[PDB]
RNA sequence: AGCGUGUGCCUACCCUACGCCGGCAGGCGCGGGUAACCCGUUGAACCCCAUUCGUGAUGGGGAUCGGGGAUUGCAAUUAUUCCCCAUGAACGAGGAAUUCCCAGUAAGUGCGGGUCAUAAGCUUGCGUUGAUUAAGUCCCUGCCCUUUGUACACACCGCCCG
């Protein structure tokens, strides 16, 4: 604690968004570090301010969902920790890492908006913002390790880490980097 | 109802105790018996008060032939319990606007007369 | 589908499954044994238990909930 | 450590095997057979269980100036799923709670209390601070 | 004299009324009060119960 | 460890044998959970296993205890025909004979013809449930 | 932990800690309290956790029914209710549709008050755990804003042809 914060017991330094733009949504701790993806956290009342929140946490919140899941952040915390362990044992490497790196591959480049069109409605490939780019990442990995969990043994901790890692690297083994692919696929044509 | 086999031959055991038994007791050592529901409403009852009634039933007991059931016994009294001293005998049990008429076999013991007088009408769906 | 039904007593050469193969394996938990051979679950778990023995596997998390073993402590 | 240095767990884990070894406790020839509350499921997976609710007790007692057996079977309580209905609180068991509070007495670890509730005795009070002491010695980890 | 006119007024909906108007429903209880809701209503500022929020 | 049955027969009925002993006896009519579980913790069996294991010897050691509840601790709350009534039994009935004496019950109440009998009899309800809006289907 | 609550009452009656018996449900003996004094440092519940289960409508689910224990009441049968066992349903994610919602907010989660003799799946608050998500706009919907048209004015749910 005192020489460096370290996360649960991981090191917010030397993590580096790689992708420009991405860069800072994304938020570890261009001072930041903390010690719990817990706290009282305000981001509701402004438009951005969900930004200054660490992504780990944003993770985390995203990961207690469905209607008997609200709520649970403890329950979250504690897959999330769980989680970075098993990624850690995977690859090294740092797990916020990893975790940032898959956030970075999945957020769909280009969309599209239902555009009126007339009769036959008609898409339109639109670009999209780095706020939704993370917004939807979060969701898509969240889901998709939710998704799997579900039917099979297998612990969130530890589909949420295979979600994780295949994303970090995108392996399209990823229900998540599929589902961005799909959507980006939708966006080019329309145009 | 008195000497070999005659008349009897339908025997029935309360609890463990033989009607023989049960027909020689106090209402008392019967309800000590396993039924608890029907004692406690006899205890609360209490005080007791169907007395003209079970004097009623004697009674139309007595009148009656030699061979047989006889007139019967009326009575509003739904939530009375049924007992061993009753058995054998004939009771108009009202619905609301009918009696009907039931006679009282062993086996109902520690039952409630309302079980045995049919309230509602089972209804329809079709026809 | 995903109907799954499982082995829930050891067959010897099961046994040997085991401690023959699970060193291969990086991630265990439950489920691995499981999908991987075809253990119970319940003798998923107590051959959790028994290899971490002295180990083929090694602890790194068994939090209530979850075990999450390693692969034993090679090169 | 006092009682309260050592965590609730281990302590509690320690002081129910050391009655296990004394022998000496005694035991309403059922546990067998009980579930310790209605808002139960099933009984007690380890049956050897009855040391584990005396020391837990115990380790209760001694916290607080006086404790008695409604207050354990609600502690002992849990949520019981009314099925239909909400789920509601449903104080545990008082046959083993009382049971648990005689047969401690019998030892002496605890004693009626004044104005009700039964208290720890010092007799309890240094047996249980003297295996907490144990307990913080076995090690570190 | 005649034994013949009564039973039980003890406790349930018939035990009770308002005492302002005989009514037998929607019944206030609390504080002792025993006024039916809507003569409450009409009563609420003379008794002291004031609207504040 | 070791094997063997998969398949079990006790007192009529077929009681799958990979199943925990518990949770495989019932199976048996008449045998809740909290009754086999109680039964179980009687006949001494490791409890921490499969019903596939295990020994023809704890078995029978189950069933002897499953109908002979009383004799072992087993309190009498915990059994399904507390004060009979023809007999004034206690008793805890088993298996094929659940059934049975479910028949006798219903039987009994519809000679005397109380009007839950007739309920039976029609296929309606006995408890004092409102038949207007439900059980239609 | 928190909002709240109580007897000594417009006419019959309170909240209840604590000892004992009972597996439970509950039974029984006490003793305080017009209460910031006592019940109640409301030692709640989610939750947290060391185990078991292992992805089987299974241990998810608790329907229906049978027997039985007790409580309220003079009286519960047409279950007031509660418990104990047993019987152990559909349901393995919901079409057309559609409600509500921006921060202690949605959602989980217990509690207390009203009803009340007894009886909560209700309503009506309260704390606890606590997100995702717009941060805007007038598209649909609804209502008021101009301008405009109107054979309407009981006002479009209006005034019409053979």
Redesign the interface.
């Known amino acids: 604690t005192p020489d460096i914060k370290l996360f649960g017991k991981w090191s917010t330094d030397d993590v580096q968004i790689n992708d420009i733009s991405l860069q800072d949504y994304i938020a570890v701790k261009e001072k930041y570090a903390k010690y719990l993806p817990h706290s009282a956290g305000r981001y509701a009342a402004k438009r951005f301010r969900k930004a200054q929140c660490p992504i780990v946490e944003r993770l985390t919140n995203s990961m207690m969902m469905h209607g008997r899941n609200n709520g649970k952040k403890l329950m979250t915390v504690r897959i999330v920790k769980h989680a970075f362990e098993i990624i850690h044992l995977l690859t090294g490497e740092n797990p916020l890492q990893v975790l940032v790196n898959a956030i970075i591959n999945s957020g769909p480049r280009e969309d599209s908006t239902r555009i009126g069109r007339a009769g036959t409605v008609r898409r339109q490939a639109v670009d999209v913002s780095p706020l939704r780019r993370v917004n939807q990442a979060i969701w898509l990995l969240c889901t998709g390790a939710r998704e799997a969990a579900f039917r099979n043994i297998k612990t969130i901790a530890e589909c949420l880490a295979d979600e994780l890692i295949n994303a970090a690297k995108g392996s399209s083994n990823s229900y998540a980097i599929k589902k961005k692919d799909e959507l980006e696929r939708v966006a080019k044509s329309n145009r | 109802v008195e000497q070999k086999k005659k008349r009897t031959f339908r025997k029935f055991t309360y609890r463990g105790v033989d009607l023989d038994q049960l027909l020689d007791m106090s209402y008392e050592q019967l309800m000590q018996l396993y039924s608890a529901r029907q004692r406690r409403r006899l205890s609360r009852g209490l005080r007791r008060k169907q007395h003209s009634l079970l004097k009623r039933l004697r009674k139309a007991k007595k009148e009656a032939p030699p061979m047989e059931k006889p007139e019967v016994v009326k009575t509003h009294l739904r939530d009375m319990i049924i007992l061993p001293e009753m058995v054998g005998s004939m009771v108009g049990v009202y619905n609301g606007k009918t009696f009907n008429q039931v006679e009282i076999k062993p086996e109902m013991i520690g039952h409630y007369l309302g079980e045995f007088s049919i309230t509602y009408k089972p209804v329809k769906h079709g026809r | 589908r995903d109907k799954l039904n499982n082995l829930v007593l050891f067959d010897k050469a099961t046994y040997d499954k085991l401690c023959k193969e699970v060193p291969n394996y990086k991630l265990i938990t439950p489920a691995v044994v499981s999908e991987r051979l075809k253990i119970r679950g319940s003798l998923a778990r107590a051959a959790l238990q028994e290899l971490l023995s002295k180990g083929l596997i090694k602890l790194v998390s068994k939090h209530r909930a979850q075990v999450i073993y390693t692969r034993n402590t090679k090169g | 450590v006092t009682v309260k240095d050592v965590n609730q767990q281990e302590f509690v884990r320690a002081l129910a095997a050391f009655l296990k070894k004394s022998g000496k406790l005694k035991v309403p020839e059922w546990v067998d057979t009980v579930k310790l509350a209605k808002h139960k499921e099933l009984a007690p997976y380890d049956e050897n269980w009855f040391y584990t609710r005396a020391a837990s007790t115990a380790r209760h007692l001694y916290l607080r100036g006086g404790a008695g057996v409604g207050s354990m079977t609600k502690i002992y309580g849990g949520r019981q799923r009314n099925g239909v209905m909400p789920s509601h609180f449903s104080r545990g068991s008082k046959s083993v709670a009382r049971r648990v509070l005689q047969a401690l007495e019998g030892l002496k670890m605890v004693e009626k209390d004044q104005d009700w509730g039964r208290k720890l005795t010092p007799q309890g009070q240094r047996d249980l601070d003297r295996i907490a002491g144990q307990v913080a010695a076995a090690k570190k980890k | 004299q005649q034994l013949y006119w009564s039973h039980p007024r003890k406790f349930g909906q018939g035990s009770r009324s308002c005492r302002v108007c005989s009514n037998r429903h929607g019944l206030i209880r609390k504080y002792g009060l025993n006024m039916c809701r809507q003569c409450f209503r009409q009563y609420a500022k003379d008794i002291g119960f004031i609207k504040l929020d | 460890?070791?094997?063997?049955q998969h398949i079990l027969r006790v007192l009529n009925t077929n009681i799958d044998g990979?199943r925990?002993i518990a949770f495989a006896i019932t199976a048996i009519k008449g045998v809740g959970?909290?009754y086999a579980?109680?039964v179980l913790?009687?006949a001494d069996i490791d409890?921490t296993k499969?019903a596939?294991?295990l020994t023809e010897d704890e078995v029978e050691r189950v069933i002897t205890i499953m109908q002979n509840p009383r004799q072992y601790?087993?309190?009498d709350w915990?059994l399904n025909r507390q004060?009979?009534?023809?007999?004034?039994?206690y008793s805890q009935v088993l298996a094929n004979g659940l059934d049975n004496k479910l028949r006798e019950d219903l039987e009994?109440?519809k000679?005397?013809?109380?009007?839950?009998g007739?309920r039976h009899f029609?296929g309606?309800r006995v408890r004092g449930q409102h038949?207007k809006t439900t059980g239609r289907r």
């Open positions: 460890p070791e094997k063997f990979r925990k959970r909290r579980h109680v913790r009687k409890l499969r596939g294991e601790k087993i309190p915990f004060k009979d009534v023809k007999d004034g039994k009994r109440l000679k005397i013809r109380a009007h839950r007739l029609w309606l038949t």
